[PDB]
Amino acid sequence: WMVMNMTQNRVFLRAINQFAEVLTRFFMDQASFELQLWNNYFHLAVAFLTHESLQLETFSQAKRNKIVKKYGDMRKEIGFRIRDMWYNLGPHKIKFIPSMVGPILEVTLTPEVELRKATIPIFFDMMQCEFNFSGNGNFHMFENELITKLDQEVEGGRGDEQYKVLLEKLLLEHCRKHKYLSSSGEVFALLVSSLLENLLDYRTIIMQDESKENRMSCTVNVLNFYKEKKREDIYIRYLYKLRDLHRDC
Amino acid sequence: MPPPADIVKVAIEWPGAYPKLMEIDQKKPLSAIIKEVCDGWSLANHEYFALQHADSSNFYITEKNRNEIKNGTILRLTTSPAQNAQQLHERIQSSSMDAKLEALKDLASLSRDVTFAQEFINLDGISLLTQMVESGTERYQKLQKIMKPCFGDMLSFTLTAFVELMDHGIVSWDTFSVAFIKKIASFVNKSAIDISILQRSLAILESMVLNSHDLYQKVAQEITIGQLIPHLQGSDQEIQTYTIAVINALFLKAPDERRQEMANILAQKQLRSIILTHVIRAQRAINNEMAHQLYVLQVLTFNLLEDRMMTKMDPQDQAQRDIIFELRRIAFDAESEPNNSSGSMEKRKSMYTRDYKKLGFINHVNPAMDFTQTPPGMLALDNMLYFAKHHQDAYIRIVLENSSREDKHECPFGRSSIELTKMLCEILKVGELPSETCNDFHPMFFTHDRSFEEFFCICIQLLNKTWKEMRATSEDFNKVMQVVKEQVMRALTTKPSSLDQFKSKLQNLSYTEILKIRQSERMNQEDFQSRPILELKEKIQPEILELIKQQRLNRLVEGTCFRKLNARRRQDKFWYCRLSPNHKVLHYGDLEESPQGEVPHDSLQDKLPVADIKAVVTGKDCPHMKEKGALKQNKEVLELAFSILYDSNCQLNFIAPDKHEYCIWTDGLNALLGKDMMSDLTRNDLDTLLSMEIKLRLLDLENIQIPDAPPPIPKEPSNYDFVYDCN
Amino acid sequence: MARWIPTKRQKYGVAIYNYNASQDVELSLQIGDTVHILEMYEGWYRGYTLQNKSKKGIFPETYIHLKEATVEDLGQHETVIPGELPLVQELTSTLREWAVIWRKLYVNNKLTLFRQLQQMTYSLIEWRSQILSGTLPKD
């Protein structure tokens, strides 16, 4: 009963919208307390956002045509509401990080572009807020698990290359919009894009016939990434994978 | 700059002589052409030669039809037409009978000109012919029993000349005398005449009827119904057409009272029964002239109904009141007591209103207001009288049916009958002149002399049945009209023979199944061969064959259990040959007894260069079948041989379970070679896949006929100016 | 290719047969190539073909069968009987899905399913051709 499901998702969107509007009505700057529920709130928001998407309906164009004729895409307004709420949210984003890192990944790697175009500046805003928090030191504390979760997402099979290119264009724009820390952010993003295309090659060759040399070069590249970025977890696990492959070869 | 056309080539032949050429310009007057011809050929007496065409026409050159002159045509010279007329006149009263025969034969054959006919008649030809016919009445009697055939043939030729002269009307109307009619009557009265003479005489009679009216009365005074019926006994269709045409001529310009009289005579003689048993049951080559005969006889029956229905039934007639009283007595003996038959008029009016308020009549004081409009007028009264006479059971059922209609959708019998009569008159084109080209014929009009009434009864009964099934409303009058028109047209196109069989086949017919089966047959034939349809499927073949090859390759990747050669001494006969998931290498070799199938691993011969494979020989050219030692294979596997040849010294010979799997394998191998397929199953699949695709695509053209000729290319503006923005 | 007017009475652009290659944008159009035309000209029509909705193709009027009917078949009273032509158009959509069905039906051998599907779709197209014209009682 796909029609039942889509109606249910529409009313889920309506429920989330009224949640947002009541939160705006009586959870403003005075209500800096009891904000821990926003964590699970947006967790559920993304958990709802992560179904009934383009690749789900990709089997026949008729499904896409009929759904855009009757409802239109709802994940688009999910992202729009999320981004406007984050714009109106406030400077307490620091506590969001260890929680908000996971959810924003899926919307980061959306199959579409335009909503991703409108959504990318959230990364610029969170990076400048991360500098606000971490001026007394460095600010790896988002990028590390950002790369890790990117790592996990592409392992799930949702990586893309022209998406990177667009990412790089956007972050070049952001660095032009910023000051001396722009060099830091842009080299970080260079590492991000290079490792992402590394894993793109890994995924596009792990389905093709085994070659065992381009993958190994990519893996030593990720090793360089991890050792330069002061991270070890996925580093040790992927060198474990390297040892497994050696054993197999 | 087209080349000038003032110079043309034309050879003028002679009978028994070889041709001579000259340049002839037709724009100049014929006098100049004659002068130039005589000057070129050095011939005197230019007035004693003329020009005629030696083609199939065999006519002379006329100012109106000289355009047939084209370069490179046989043209032989003849003498001048004046000299031809003079010699014919001299030889008319000659001493040689063969000369007379040939001269009259030529005269009749070359009797297809008008102006030359004028010139010949200017020589008192008609007067001389009349004089020799009048004086020849007793002259040929002595030699009649000697040369009846030749004399009859000459008479036929002269009558043909007379007919064509009358058609051109060159002879005057008043010049006709009673001698011609008397001679034709004498010809008819003879009992030893041939079939052709009778046909010519009846043609003369019908021409006489078409000319005037009093001569029609004269011939009808000597016309009996008992002599034109034996003409029907003849199996020839032409004589039947002639007799029917003369019969129609009898109904052309006669008073309507005599029309009814002779119609009653035909009915009492039961002409339609013998017509049905003679011409309808014949399965010979039906002529379009007979179709015209059927159409004009249908028109005659329609006029015989109209001349009695064209008048308006006066509501003030007491006889009409008595007739409708008796009709409603014999119709409504369910609600009306029998005592009202001899009763007063108050109960008559009470029954009128109580029985017409259930039949959609508004006025209750003057019930006969609806009987002043024709068609049909009183035809409905005749139909209901016939219903009471023959269908009294159905009549009573219908009487008890409409009055019991509780669905608030009672059908007005009078209004529906008027509408149906109007539709029938419109579809049958009542009141128009007969067509000169259309040859539609309905053989069911000859089943009964009252055939139209039977047809209308069957139609109204079918309509009542269909309406009872549907229970129609007042909002689908257009639907009712269109469905009845379509069913009537479909019934007419079926060409029925008998009334009962026609009515049964009306119910036996499906819901336009003929159109569907015809469309399917046409599509199948176009698939076999067509100019504007067959090229469509063969034009677009990029995906069907490619995906067939993909399916074959997927069949190769999954693989199956194969068989080995000479595996009788501890050699396993189960093994696998799996294609790479990249579709470039083959994994095959010596394996074990595997009922499960293929085991995923590297085989003994894990490599097979597909670019080094030359071809796959199919049949008796496989080297492994050519051993003369001890490893000979069975003749039973002659259908199971195929070898992958490479290196010119090593052969990959494989064994198949049965035919279809080997066909699959050889199709896969050629697909690796990128060639055509060699499987009956593929051909079995090739037809349907294309058939399925075009069956899908034909829905856009459904209800729309596809033109055969290529549509033209209409002009387009040169500019790309967009009044409405693109995208 | 000038004088193009917006119009909504030509959505069902019925072809005839494989069109000539005189125009680069025009190809050997298939039988079911309904052109969703958004421009009106006296002797030509350029619109979006069903196979490629993103590519325009200029088509002659003599190559276009006049179909004023829209997807809504009651506003213009095109229906032979009300409430039937929506069924035929949803059936057309169903068969356009049947296209991708039999396209994906050959990836895996479904011989029993494939043959019974052949029989069912045969009866389907038979009944569609049967009810191409609505002239039967409502039952």
Numbering used by the authors:
A (entry chain B): 1006 to 1254
B (entry chain A): 1 to 727
C (entry chain B): 1 to 139
Would you copy out the relevant sentences from the publication that reported this structure?
The human DOCK5 and ELMO1 complex, along with an upstream signalling factor, a constitutively active mutant of RhoGQ61L tagged with polyhistidine at the C-terminus, and a substrate, nucleotide-free mutant Rac1G15A also tagged with a poly His-tag at its C-terminus, were reacted on a grid coated with a lipid membrane [67PC/21PA/6PIP3/6DOGS-NTA Ni (mol%)], followed by cryo-EM data collection. ELMO1NTD, which interacted with DHR-2 via the Ras-binding domain (RBD) in its auto-inhibited closed form (right), diverged from DHR-2 and expanded along the lipid membrane surface due to the binding of RhoG to the RBD (left). The lipid-modified active form of RhoG should be located on the plasma membrane to activate the DOCK5•ELMO1 complex. Therefore, as observed in the present study, RhoG may stabilize the extended-open form by promoting a series of conformational changes in the positive direction by holding the dissociated NTD from DHR-2 close to the membrane through interaction with the RBD. Furthermore, the upstream factor RhoG on the plasma membrane plays a role in promoting and maintaining the conformational change to the extended-open form by binding to the NTD of ELMO1.
Herein, we present a new conformation in which DOCK5, ELMO1, RhoG, and Rac1 are aligned on a plane and symmetrically flattened, as revealed by cryo-EM using a lipid membrane-coated grid.
